[PDB]
């Protein structure tokens, strides 16, 4: 709910779990 700055899992999920990081960006 507030454990970090808007960086708890909402969108790290799919960057932070490593994901579209590195893709959606060919």
Request: net charge positive; hydrophobic share 40%; glycine share 20%.
């Amino acid at each position: 709910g507030r454990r970090k700055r808007k960086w708890l899992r909402r969108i790290g999920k799919g960057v932070k779990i490593i994901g579209g990081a590195a893709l959606d960006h060919l």
